[PDB]
Amino acid sequence: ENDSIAYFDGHKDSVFAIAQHPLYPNIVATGGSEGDADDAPGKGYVLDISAATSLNPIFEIDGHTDSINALTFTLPRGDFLVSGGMDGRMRVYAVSVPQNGALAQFKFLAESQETEEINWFAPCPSPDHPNTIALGASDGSVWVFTLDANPVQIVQSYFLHTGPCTAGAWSPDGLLLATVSEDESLHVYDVFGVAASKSLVTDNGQTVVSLTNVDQRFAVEGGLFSVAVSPTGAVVAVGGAGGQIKIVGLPRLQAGTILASLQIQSDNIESLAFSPSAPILAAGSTDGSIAVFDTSRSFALRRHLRGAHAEDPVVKVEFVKSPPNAAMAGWLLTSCGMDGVVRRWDLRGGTAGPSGLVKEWKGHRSGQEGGGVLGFVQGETGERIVTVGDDAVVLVFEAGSHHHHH
């Protein structure tokens, strides 16, 4: 019924976004809508989960005149907290986390509003370019900013998509940024100019891969909604309408060709994740299923988990980076859905060539009752999961790998 060990009910309506500090997993920001009126503002909070039953915020994020839709702490060390709204506002806060005193301080620095609606954030993982963030917007544009020193630098502003930019993902080296659109296009941007210097950019001078609706072998009718890049940076996966997934080659810094096409599930692929260390790709669908493909076997189907979240949308799937049982590295997947449940899966099973349900966490309302889980973070080890719900609640769950035996 309710597996949570703590909660936060301060949001007045849908909690759309959540971010976790990269060094301090107890520091989590949540953001969403304060109501359904046309003029309802957005609101965010910063929480300290180490206090985990009712949580009290350590900071409040004000200034958004519409729902907060995106949050991120910057890489590598969370120097900034950035909020992004349906008002197009990007608000930048400096973060200080004193190992001495009672910790976290947050200071507003700047606001940028180059678009009307922010759809997503993705921090750049390049160690060479700290505190760099990308976003995609409803006008199809993709912006890359660096937070340094006019504290907001514009690194890139791209206008290649012609419809809403629905998702973005960096390559692991942080040199490429892959984004997708409702208009069915994929563009992979040479953000820092490295590919251009190696004569690996397309005719438009900006991308290393550009595929659109005119490319018949690529076109996914109804649009693209998710994107993920493999751990070696060798391929990008895009997911879209009708359960379709396309695998496209990237240059290593071969490029732009379709290496595999998939369509096992029946509705929008809303979430895609490559395992960080097992040769598998997981896809979550609006139809409630998760599908697992073997990346070293032409993306053969390993397992089709029908009803992973009943017949409600699978909103997010994400691999546990460093599970307590080191032997399970790369094989443990956490998912959340509009059924109001968070689940974790052991993906070793299935057809691997030459259920797997591990744990369920309940507490949110289902979509049918006005809830649904819209997002989560789970730290490095997956042992503490913090959720955001359409039922305006934030929950904290634990995996309990440490039994504290006597």
Residue numbers in the entry: 54 to 105, 127 to 223, 228 to 331, 366 to 466, 489 to 540
What does the paper say about this structure?
In the case of Sqt1, we were able to decipher the mode of L10-N peptide binding by X-ray crystallography. These structural analyses showed that the C-terminal domain of Sqt1, which is preceded by a non-essential N-terminal extension of ∼50 amino acids, folds into an eight-bladed WD-repeat β-propeller. Moreover, the binding mode of the N-terminal residues of Rpl10 (L10-N) by the eight-bladed WD-repeat β-propeller of Sqt1, as revealed by X-ray crystallography, allows establishing a refined model for the final pre-60S maturation events that lead to the stable incorporation of Rpl10 and the release of Nmd3. Taken together, we propose that Sqt1 may protect Rpl10 from aggregation before and/or promote its incorporation into almost mature pre-60S subunits in the cytoplasm. We conclude that the β-propeller domains of Sqt1 and Rrb1, which harbour the essential function of these proteins, recognize the very N-terminal residues of Rpl10 and Rpl3.
To this end, we also performed in vitro binding assays with the orthologous proteins from the thermophilic, filamentous ascomycete Chaetomium thermophilum (ct), whose proteins often exhibit improved biochemical properties. Both ctSqt1 and ctSqt1.52C (deletion of amino acids 2–51), which fully complement the absence of Sqt1 in vivo, could be efficiently co-purified with ctRpl10 or its N-terminal 20 residues. While the N-terminal extension could not be resolved, the crystal structures revealed that residues 52–533 of ctSqt1 form a typical eight-bladed WD-repeat β-propeller; thus, being composed of eight blades that each contain four β-strands and showing the characteristic ‘velcro' closure owing to the presence of the N-terminal β-strand as the outermost β-strand of the eighth blade. Sqt1 and ctSqt1 share a high degree of overall structural conservation and mainly differ in three ctSqt1-specific insertions located in the loops connecting β-strands 1c-1d, 5c-5d and 7c-7d.
